[PDB]
Design a protein around this ligand. Structure first.
Ligand code: LVV
Ligand code: LVV
Length: 492
């Protein structure tokens, strides 16, 4: 890594310096590093140029605004300081070049939208890996090779971090990466120089866009951004209103629908579910497409996961993965752990474990579960103690309305009186007397599972993958998934 070669596309006469790492943070900037001094909200990195120099950085690249002209090479204490205009806009490209263009050394698929980003990302990574790739994910659940994702707990990734982490995955042997792209990330030019093989839009609609002008400006803002990016093949959910409008303007984009929103007259590429049977262990999805027709046995639950699966299918088809091989591997696609995760056993009720711990998520989960439920829908849940109490009666009302049997139990009561939490939940119900209350979560889960009929579905909500019950100050070892598996005579 040489400063001269790094800047060759932009600054021809740049000094030759060996460079170690690229950083925006003067605190971590060590000897031999390239320190990049940017201007943002409140913060001006050029402030810390002397500190970085004092810490022995090999070179600096700095926002030219007000202090210099574009491409201006200065020299401070023997260290090159090269100034670039609109440095925030160019940071992705700068870092891309520094890290040897990792997006040109694997197949990068970007996924954007409000809902289904995480799931669609995981399905892309899983499915590609089943077809022989070494797949990776980047997003909110974390970054890493499939099955080895390191959480992004409390770390906002800059344009440099994005390129760095992608290069990390390349180094680890990744040939495919499914990346969640946040609305904020796109606007802040954090993926500006990435060569996306495909861009997947789970939805383009947003709230607070009722005025024609606002909708107009939103669309224009986004369309502008996408015109500046290397998006590759566009795969767009046509069940979204904005999606459809965009599809009408994008003859090379792939239209994906499960609600009959494909318009055959355009002769574009398309994929649509023609019928779905939601059964006790997943969904049988019959589909037609410009690549051919087929039938997939998905082990994911609900209509939203049909959409997500179809988006991943359409994307991989667009990228040239053979339909036959995709069909042959579809049954091996699994849910994101504790996200509408189905557990079935011969002659037992179907049990779904989901993380849903808010009123909207609980409603969505129950609505999804209902589709697969020939008999009665059971809902086993509680609410966390020592947290906001407002959701409690709302979750009670939801359980009462969207389930047939509400089983109210404990869920991390912490230091709060467990029964007090339950009372708050019951308060929200029209007929609290119709709900079952059982304390001991394990006991409540058992109650539902052992009593529920063969054709019933039991939703166990609130924890998903979170393998503990916080009672008092103890993080006691407990798992909904393990409890359910044992009750069904299967393995979690
Ligand atoms: C430290 C780190 C955190 C997160 C990411 C992932 N990246 C976030 C920004 S994004 O949404 O524009 C594209 C994905 C990378 C590195
Ligand atoms: C998903 C997406 C990708 C690109 C664009 C902008 N692009 C401008 C050049 S074009 O008219 O050839 C094709 C559209 C918008 C949306």
């Amino acid at each position: 890594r040489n400063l001269r070669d790094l800047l060759a596309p932009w600054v021809p006469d740049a000094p030759s310096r060996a460079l170690r790492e690229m950083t925006l943070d003067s605190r971590v900037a060590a000897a031999g590093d390239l320190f990049v001094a940017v201007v943002g909200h409140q913060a001006d990195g050029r402030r810390y140029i002397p500190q970085a120099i004092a810490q022995g950085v090999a070179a600096i690249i700095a926002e030219a605004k007000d202090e210099a002209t574009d491409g201006e090479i200065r020299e401070m204490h023997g260290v090159p300081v090269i100034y670039l205009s609109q440095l925030n806009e160019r940071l992705s490209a700068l870092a891309g070049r520094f890290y040897h263009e990792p997006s040109d050394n694997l197949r990068l698929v970007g996924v954007t939208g409000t809902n289904g980003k995480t799931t669609t990302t995981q399905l892309l990574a899983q499915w590609s890996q089943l077809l022989g790739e070494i797949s990776a994910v980047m997003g909110t659940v974390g970054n890493g090779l499939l099955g080895k994702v390191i959480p992004t707990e409390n770390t906002t990734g800059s344009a440099v971090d994005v390129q760095h982490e992608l290069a990390g995955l390349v180094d680890q042997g990744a040939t495919f990466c499914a990346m969640e792209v946040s609305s904020h990330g796109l606007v802040q030019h954090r993926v500006a120089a990435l060569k996306f093989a495909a861009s997947v839009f789970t939805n383009l609609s947003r709230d607070h866009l009722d005025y024609h002008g606002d909708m107009e400006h939103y669309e224009a803002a986004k369309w502008l951004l996408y015109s500046e990016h290397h998006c590759g093949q566009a795969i767009i959910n046509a069940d979204d209103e904005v999606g459809r409008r965009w599809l009408a303007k994008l003859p090379d984009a792939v239209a994906v629908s499960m609600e009959d929103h494909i318009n055959p007259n355009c002769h574009g590429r398309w994929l649509k579910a023609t019928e779905v049977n939601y059964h006790d262990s997943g969904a049988t999805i019959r589909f037609s497409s410009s690549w051919g027709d087929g039938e997939i046995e998905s082990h994911l639950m609900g209509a939203f996961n049909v959409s997500n699966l179809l988006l991943a299918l359409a994307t991989l088809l667009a990228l040239g993965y053979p339909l036959a091989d995709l069909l042959k591997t579809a049954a091996r696609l699994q849910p994101v752990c504790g996200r509408m995760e189905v557990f079935t056993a011969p002659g037992k009720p179907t049990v779904v474990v989901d993380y849903a711990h808010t009123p909207d998520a609980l409603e969505k989960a129950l609505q999804a579960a209902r589709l697969h439920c020939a008999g009665k829908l059971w809902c086993v849940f509680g609410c966390g103690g020592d947290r906001d109490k407002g959701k409690r009666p709302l979750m009670g009302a939801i359980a009462e309305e969207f389930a047939d049997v509400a089983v109210v139990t404990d869920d991390n009561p912490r230091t709060e009186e467990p029964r007090a939490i339950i009372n708050d939940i019951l308060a929200g119900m029209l007929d609290a007397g119709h709900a079952k209350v059982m304390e001991g979560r394990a006991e409540a889960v058992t109650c539902a599972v052992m009593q529920a009929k063969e054709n019933d579905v039991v939703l166990v909500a609130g924890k998903g993958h979170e393998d503990y019950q916080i009672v008092g100050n103890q993080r006691l070892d407990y798992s909904d998934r393990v409890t359910v598996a044992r009750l069904l005579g299967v393995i979690a």
